[PDB]
Amino acid sequence: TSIMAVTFKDGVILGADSRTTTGAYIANRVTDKLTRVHDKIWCCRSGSAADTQAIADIVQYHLELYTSQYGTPSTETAASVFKELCYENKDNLTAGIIVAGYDDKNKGEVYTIPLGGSVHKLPYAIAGSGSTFIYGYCDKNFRENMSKEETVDFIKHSLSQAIKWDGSSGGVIRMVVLTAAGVERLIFYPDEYEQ
Amino acid sequence: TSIMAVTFKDGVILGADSRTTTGAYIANRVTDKLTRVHDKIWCCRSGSAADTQAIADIVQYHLELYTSQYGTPSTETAASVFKELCYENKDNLTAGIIVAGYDDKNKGEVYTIPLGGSVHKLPYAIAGSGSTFIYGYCDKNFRENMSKEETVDFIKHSLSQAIKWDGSSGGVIRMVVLTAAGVERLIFYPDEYEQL
Amino acid sequence: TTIVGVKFNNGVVIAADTRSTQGPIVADKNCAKLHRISPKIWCAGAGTAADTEAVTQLIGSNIELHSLYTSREPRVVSALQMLKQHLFKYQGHIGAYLIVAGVDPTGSHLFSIHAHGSTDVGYYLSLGSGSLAAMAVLESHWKQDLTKEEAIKLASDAIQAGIWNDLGSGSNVDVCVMEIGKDAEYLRNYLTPNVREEKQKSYKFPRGTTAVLKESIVNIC
Amino acid sequence: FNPYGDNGGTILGIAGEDFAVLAGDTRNITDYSINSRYEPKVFDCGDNIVMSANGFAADGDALVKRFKNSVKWYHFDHNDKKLSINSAARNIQHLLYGKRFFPYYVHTIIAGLDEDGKGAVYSFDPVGSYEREQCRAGGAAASLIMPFLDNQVNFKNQYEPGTNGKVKKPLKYLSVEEVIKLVRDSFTSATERHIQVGDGLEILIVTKDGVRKEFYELKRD
Amino acid sequence: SSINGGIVVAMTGKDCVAIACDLRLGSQSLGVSNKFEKIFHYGHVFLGITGLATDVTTLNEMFRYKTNLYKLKEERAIEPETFTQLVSSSLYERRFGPYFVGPVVAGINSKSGKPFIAGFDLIGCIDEAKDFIVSGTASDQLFGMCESLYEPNLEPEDLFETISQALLNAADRDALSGWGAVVYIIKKDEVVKRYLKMRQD
Amino acid sequence: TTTLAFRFQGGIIVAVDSRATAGNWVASQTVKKVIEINPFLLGTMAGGAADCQFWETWLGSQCRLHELREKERISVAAASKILSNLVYQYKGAGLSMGTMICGYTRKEGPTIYYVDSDGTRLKGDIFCVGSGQTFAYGVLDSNYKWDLSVEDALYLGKRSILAAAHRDAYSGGSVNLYHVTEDGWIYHGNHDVGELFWKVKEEEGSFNNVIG
Amino acid sequence: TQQPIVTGTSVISMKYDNGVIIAADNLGSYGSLLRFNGVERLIPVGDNTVVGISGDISDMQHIERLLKDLVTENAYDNPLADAEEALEPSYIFEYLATVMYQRRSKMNPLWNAIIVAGVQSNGDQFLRYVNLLGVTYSSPTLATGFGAHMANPLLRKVVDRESDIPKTTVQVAEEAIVNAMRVLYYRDARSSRNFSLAIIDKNTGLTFKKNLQVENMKWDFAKDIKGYG
Amino acid sequence: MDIILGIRVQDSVILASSKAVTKDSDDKTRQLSPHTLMSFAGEAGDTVQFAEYIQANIQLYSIREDYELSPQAVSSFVRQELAKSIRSRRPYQVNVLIGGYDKKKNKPELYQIDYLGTKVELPYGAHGYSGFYTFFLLDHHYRPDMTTEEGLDLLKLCVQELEKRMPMDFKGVIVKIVDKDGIRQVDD
Amino acid sequence: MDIILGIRVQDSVILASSKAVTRSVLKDSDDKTRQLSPHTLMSFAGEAGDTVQFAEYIQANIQLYSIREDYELSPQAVSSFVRQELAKSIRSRRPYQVNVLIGGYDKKKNKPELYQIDYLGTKVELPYGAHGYSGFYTFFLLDHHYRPDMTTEEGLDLLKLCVQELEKRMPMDFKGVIVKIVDKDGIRQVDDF
């Protein structure tokens, strides 16, 4: 419902909320919208849950085969696999997917795949129903070559605004940092971003 | 359409875009969406042009009659007239109105009448198709008391973002300031706000 | 169907084409679309022709009665208000889309009125099926300082573009100029670029070709 | 998704005593917008056979190219034997009926010379019914041309003067010039009364010598 | 509308007019009558009505009523232009409830002496043409025939032949018309009514 | 469209009109509504022209193959049942067809079968299928007998077609006659309906209601 | 396939005496939301072909991948793949039209309007149009979608017939294209201020201009409009 | 459904009406005037209501003026009533045949009025599909100088053709004759 | 539209089928029956085209079985086969809209048998039955007058009464009826009914 990915200076941070609603009722108050595809190169998905889970499983299997047979996949390879899966089933699935990854050569890459199967790189990406309320703010407060803490603060502010102004979005704020050091998981509770 | 009204220390400030579209075609690019219903009471209209114009004319007539009979109506009175008109004919009208006025209450006053004819009094209000993209921003850059220049800059930034991200909004930015000195009209062209 | 209005430094100019069709068939090839509301307040209509004619005549009669009652020259704002209130009362069922130009003691005015009852103000306006080509031409070749000749030529060029590029528009061009301080000047068939050209044969039947059963005389006189 | 569309053309085929004429307008349009002013629809398919499909442009082009391929394969498989007009008509009928449940949205007219050397015109319906005729018009202006041809070619409703409608006007041989004049007059009238008709007239004449082409200008140049 | 059939065509000649109409009346495919005339005259102005036959008869009766009252009140026969305005106003009075008719008015003004023809739409939009007016289920064929055949300033003898040929050839291509035709040639003081011989009847 | 066919001592008489209309506009008045299946078989066109032409030409090809293989002319019943079985496969796909298969064979004499697009196939003596079938069928029923000469039968067919054309707005541009005998069909020309109406009114005192 | 999600905008093109000019904006609208910017919709094929695509952009990427594959395939076992056996605008247009018609016939169309522009090997300018349903036609000036209603009337004022093509210089055609783009930005709600333009000339070759911006706009008179009465 | 037929012979008007209501003794006729009869067909009891209303109006006129209306005036009145009915809520779905003998001109007359309000005054007429199965015979065996017996024989032929060639069983027919002496019913 | 009636007596089965083929009336002498076997007859009604095809298919299958086995199928076996075919067709792409009556004479038991089957596949063994709307008009007569011990003449009289009632009551004119009789001597057709 509120999904984001930003590449600052040393890697990529992907952030999301944790609210899953089956209508006006909250079906899952704390859901993990961040799914691992490989060790690196993994981000969050929006839209229908079943389609996104199936696409994520298929992409994970395909990239496992790619790693076993031809070396190590890049972020663009995962973006292409997602694009093919979304485009060939254009009339069958409604997912919407952002893919974020890290590698030594490029040091952080993001790809956006909306409904219809198109793919765009962009320096930062926002998606979901709540992101509609943060289009201006994210445009007014994004800079290239930021530090990790500044990126965490920017994601926290944007996701807090999205949670506040969207009914179907917002539990806790989950963040994943992918850099050369490794993969780091962060969680921010409502008492933090609401104040 | 993107419309907003914010109260500051010396009064109230109203801002609007100048785009009217029929489907995907821009019928008007110099639209004036700021309507005067009393000397220091103005309204911002969104939705059906005919409904909003008719409601504004009727409210202006009622306020003129009130002035002839009673004196100077308050902004709450104009908001009440708008609410009555919108609520009585909710099934046949599509109009979202923001009523902003400066009077002895000071610091300006803003009322919101969304679809359905409800009334809400807010320090600042946004409306239109382009407001959805500037909600969070306006919640992070608003303060209760601001000067004239700061308020103008805030309006300019908000409407610039709304025009940038909404295809139904565009053109020039028109602003109206209501203070004890009177009424001021400001125009900001695309060569100015497309950067800041 | 293409109607254009352009304001110039000393008044307003309105122009239209002279084609009236029903479906893909051309009914009238010299139809008049410039309707006179008052001697110096004119209007051009698009949409249902009958509705446009009836509403213009009704508003003109009402404004004439008002002018006689008040002993003052009619104002185009009064006509605009009457038209907009009437159309809003009928909620767009009266399919008239009007461009109203005029000159009153308060100056020259140009407005556009839609079926549902919404009005717009501008220095140049276009309405109809060929309105997009006319609007493109107006956007391409307009400036603040326009003489009467420049405004007339711009309106005529917009109408010509609408004629040449829109299938629903064609035939001739009619132009009315208000020109504050002067009488309104009407120019019907200002441009006639669509002659029919001579046919290859004459089709005059010989007398007696048609077989006649009975011939009588009607007492009508 | 709607897999069909209309491009608004008009074609006409007339068979003479020793010649055939197939004419068509060159205007391609869609929903009151002019796609092109010169988009030919009448093609020489070979073996002195001239074919024209009117209506859906894509289906017409597909049918024309399929018929040309069929002619090529017929020449390959039968020692370059010339394809007769009736054989071509039957082959086109089979081609049209092969997709009856997803039919071409076109009306087809083919013209040539028969095995005896006389002009032959064959008309087809969208689902594959064909008949040999002397004069056949297709398109949106067919209803505005066929009565005129019936009056001026078959001399219908005409009688010799002085007989009080007892002796019909005898049929007379018409040269190719007279057919050309009648076609030009009919297309001029169609251009006058139909918005979708008229940017240029292209005529193909088939005789024993071969196929020749003529072009004339219409309104909306 | 378009369930009874019928076509009317009016043309303007030199100091004269012509108005012709078919005679078929039917219920869809079935033919009922071959004598249903669709042309009437009041004073010196002629009116032809196509479309629903019931509405044709109702309009004829109402217009005769109004014209008789006009003659009684004003002590003068009504002119073609005033009658055209009256018909347009009467048709517009039934907005949203219109008569499913196509009217055509013809006649020569008594005072000025010039010919006049006009046509009306469903709701009374006046279409004034100086060459010809057509109405009915075969209006496309009538338009084609008139565009191909009509010439300006025709003598009544040639005008009759032209309008008769146009009407007959247009009716021969229409399934809901062509059970007999009647033509009126109208001059300053003389009117001639002729019946035509045609196929299918 | 009337397309009548009846049996008599001399064989079979088939009579059709030639009017084709689309949206109340007459598309053509020279439409051949009789399909010559082979030198010994005729069929009538009603419903969809393309379906009738295509499938009756296919039936002619099948009959040619049958006569090549069996060295014997195919009976009318066999050809009619072949056509009916072919049509029954395509039922529900939108085919529209009403046909009269008429043939004179040595074994079965003169025979007329009616086959529609719904799969019905029935043998009969008199058939009239079309928009104006009622008037022609009434005329035939009023003036039928298994004693008529060839000329009387041809005139009866012309009269029935004329009545149908006069009382139906979708029928009648011309009249086409065919006479089927054991040696095949004979074509008896094309007669204009307009002239035929006047000729019949002058000879027989019918159509008094029409002024002439 | 069944409905477009992310859509492009009008593509305009015209012929001048020595070649073709084709321009298109860089917007990736998502309905009423201008979601994506900097999207290139003019695909260069070879040194002599430019393909302009309007409509669904996922299908645009699909057919540009198809064009890349076709270029790769043309070079296989072709020693003259760069001199005389190279791809031509006519071949590319025929392949694209065949693909579009085959997609239409299967009720699974590519929601695009495509303009193919270039210079043939004999020096003749090629400029043709295709779309869904496989409808093809040619004209001295072409425009897709919204630009078909506003850009074409202006361009036809310069090149109205075939005989006008030899009389039009490259400068006049480029000025007309820029003016048409400015008008489209004036009156189209799905338009963008930035656009790309390609010129194919028989002598000079392929010139690509990216990051162009609409300028010299008029907004001063808007200060004089107030209210609606 | 229901069959209504009428033939005007040189000195009489013959009207034939179906006797089936979906009863076998149904009289679908009303004597409007001693020299004017009307047969009605179509929908349900709206037909009876319309016929009774017309009959009451005509009887009131005859009582007031002591002078019966001509068939033309009666037909015009019925056509006006139907035309008013169609343009308002609750229209009448009634098709009528009016047969009357004009004493002033000494002549029979027959009028056919549709439910919409269309009047023709044919020499012979029918309402419904009965025109399809009979109009050929009436186009072949009708003269303007025929007598009453010839008209009765022609009507018998038409009724037999209707029975033979119509899938609907209308349960016989009832025949009325209008002439100088008034209205009689044929008992054959 | 089509009247199909069947009655069973102590030693015979009587079947009656209408003649009208109206769709305007084309044929008035249609025989809506097929001889499955010398002791088994089938009467059919329903949709046009389907009935004749289904009847001929059943007849061909029964004749093929009889030729292959040199033995005649009992009426119960034929009824079961027809019901199974209808039940298979009910869930196919193009089901047959056919209602059938089967009249047979079991020679092994020397006993008449009557079966009624609908297009759905509901088979019932009844002393008498009807397909369509004729049941509504003839059921009173059949319930009041029928006896298990009846002769051919009594059954014919009852059928005449039922046909007269149908003529007096049915708004549709079925234009007579054709009556066939199945007994130990085979199948016969009566005349002057």
Residue C189 C-alpha, separation from nearest chain E C-alpha, in angstroms = 15
Nearest to F108 by CA among F41, F177, F155: F41
Counted across chains D and E, CB pairs separated by less than 8 A come out at 52
H helix and E strand count, chain H: 4, 9
- Residues in contact with G144: Cβ distance below 8 Å, sequence separation at least 6, in sequence order: G10, G11, G12, G52, G54, G55, G113, G114, G115, G129, G131
Could you give the CA distance from residue C176 to residue G208 in angstroms, rounded to a whole number?
47
D32/C199 CB distance under 8 A: no
Angle at H163 between CA H157 and CA H166, to 5 degrees: 120
Tell me the residue ranges of DSSP E strands in chain F: 4-8, 11-16, 20-22, 25-28, 34-38, 41-44, 98-105, 109-116, 121-124, 126-128, 174-181, 184-192
Instruction: With beta carbons under 8 A apart, name residues in chain F contacting D128.
Output: 50, 53-54
Interface of C with D in 74-113 (CB under 8 A): none
Subunits with 3+ Cβ pairs within 8 Å of A are: B, G
Could you give the CA distance from residue A89 to residue I169 in angstroms, rounded to a whole number?
62
DSSP F168: B
Q: What is the CATH number of the domain that holds F14?
A: 3.60.20.10
Nearest to D20 by CA among D147, D124, D114: D114
Could you give the CA distance from residue D219 to residue D195 in angstroms, rounded to a whole number?
11
Phi, psi values for residue E80, rounded to 5°: -60, -35
Domains and their CATH numbers in chain E: 1-201 (3.60.20.10)
Could you give the CA distance from residue G225 to residue C113 in angstroms, rounded to a whole number?
16
Question: Judging by beta carbons within 10 Å of its beta carbon (0-12, 13-18, 19+), is residue H63 exposed, middle or buried?
Answer: exposed
Phi, psi values for residue H81, rounded to 5°: -60, -45
- Residues in contact with F71: Cβ distance below 8 Å, sequence separation at least 6, in sequence order: none
Q: What is the CATH number of the domain that holds C180?
A: 3.60.20.10
Please write down the HEC assignment for all residues of chain G.
Answer: CCCCCCECCCEEEEEECCEEEEEEECECCCCCECCCECCCCEEEECCCEEEEEEEEHHHHHHHHHHHHHHHHHHCCCCCCCCCCCCCCHHHHHHHHHHHHHHHHHCCCCCCEEEEEEEECCCCCEEEEEEEHHHCCEECCEEECCCHHHHHHHHHCCCCCCHHHHHHCCHHHHHHHHHHHHHHHHHHECCCCCEEEEEEEECCCEEEEEEEEECCCCCCHHHHHCCCCC
H and C make contact (3+ CB pairs below 8 Å) = no
Distances (CA, A) of A30 to A15, A19, A171, G118, H164: 14, 6, 6, 57, 82
Could you give the CA distance from residue B89 to residue C85 in angstroms, rounded to a whole number?
17
Which of G1, G2, G57 lies at the smallest CB-CB distance from A118?
G57
Number of domains, chain F:
1
Counted across chains F and H, CB pairs separated by less than 8 A come out at 43
Could you give the CA distance from residue D160 to residue C209 in angstroms, rounded to a whole number?
6
Which of E30, E36, E58 lies at the smallest CB-CB distance from H83?
E58
Exp. method: cryo-EM
Instruction: With beta carbons under 8 A apart, name residues in chain G contacting D3.
Output: 104-105, 107, 109, 133
Domain that holds residue G52: 1-229
Number of domains, chain G:
1
Domain that holds residue B105: 1-196
Chain A touched by B134 (CB under 8 Å): yes
Active-site residue list of G: 1
Instruction: With beta carbons under 8 A apart, name residues in chain A contacting B128.
Output: none
Q: What is the CATH number of the domain that holds G60?
A: 3.60.20.10
Q: Are D45 and G121 in contact (CB under 8 A)?
A: no
Tally of residues, chain I: 193
Q: Are B193 and B154 in contact (CB under 8 A)?
A: no
Which of G153, G182, G229 lies at the smallest CB-CB distance from C80?
G229
Phi, psi values for residue I6, rounded to 5°: -145, 140
Q: What is the CATH number of the domain that holds B104?
A: 3.60.20.10
H168/I170 CB distance under 8 A: no
Q: What is the resolution of this structure in A?
A: 2.4
Could you give the CA distance from residue F191 to residue F188 in angstroms, rounded to a whole number?
9
Largest separation between any pair of C-alpha atoms in chain A:
50
Could you give the CA distance from residue I116 to residue I41 in angstroms, rounded to a whole number?
12
Number of domains, chain A:
1
Interface of H with F in 100-159 (CB under 8 A): 122-124, 132-137, 139-140, 142-144, 157
Task: Give the best residue of C19, C209, C215 to mutate against chain D (max D CB count within 10 A).
Answer: C209
Could you give the CA distance from residue G113 to residue B41 in angstroms, rounded to a whole number?
50
Collapse the DSSP code of F23 into the 3-class scheme (helix H, G, I; strand E, B; otherwise coil) and give the result: coil
Tell me the residue ranges of DSSP E strands in B18-136: 20-22, 25-28, 34-38, 41-47, 95-101, 109-113, 120-121, 124-128
- How many alpha carbons lie under 13 Å from residue H51 in its C-beta half-sphere? 24
Phi, psi values for residue D30, rounded to 5°: -160, 120
Nearest to D14 by CA among D181, D216, D189: D181
Nearest to C209 by CA among E159, E177, F193: E159
Nearest to D63 by CA among B18, G34, G105, G169: G105
Collapse the DSSP code of B48 into the 3-class scheme (helix H, G, I; strand E, B; otherwise coil) and give the result: coil
Could you give the CA distance from residue D72 to residue D78 in angstroms, rounded to a whole number?
10
- Residues in contact with B57: Cβ distance below 8 Å, sequence separation at least 6, in sequence order: none
Domain that holds residue C177: 1-221
Residue E153 C-alpha, separation from nearest chain H C-alpha, in angstroms = 38
F and I make contact (3+ CB pairs below 8 Å) = yes
For residues G35, G37, G41 and G45, what is the CA-based torsion angle, rounded to 10 degrees? -130
Domain that holds residue F192: 1-212
Phi, psi values for residue F19, rounded to 5°: -105, 130
- Residues in contact with A47: Cβ distance below 8 Å, sequence separation at least 6, in sequence order: A94, A95, A96, A115
